[PDB]
Amino acid sequence: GAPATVTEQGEDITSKKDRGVLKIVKRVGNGEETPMIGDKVYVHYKGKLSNGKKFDSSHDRNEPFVFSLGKGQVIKAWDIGVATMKKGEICHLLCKPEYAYGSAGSLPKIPSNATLFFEIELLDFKG
């Protein structure tokens, strides 16, 4: 399935080249510009655990998730991954725990040492 495919076929987008965040572009977005640090970014997402459980989805809440890019308001994988996206793009991210919640995990759904899968759509970005 999609988690396996991005695990085996994704591109390493980390600056360290440590395979901690792999990405596949599923839907090409618009033009060439990516957001800049500090921009308000609006995303839709779906997250799955390695046991197959869906642990979150913005679609189901009927509102996008909004954060300021590059400020550590989200897991590292999201700061790194969204920074690579164009407006309108959909990608898959496969995130090792060092770029997510590490040994701590995150109650209720995310265990310790969890590799996470996400589908992310970048709806918009603005300064």
Binding site: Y45, G47, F55, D56, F65, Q73, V74, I75, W78, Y101, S106, L107, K109, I110
Partner: peptide, 5 residues
Amino acid sequence: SFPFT
């Protein structure tokens, strides 16, 4: 909580 931290 997710999707924060």
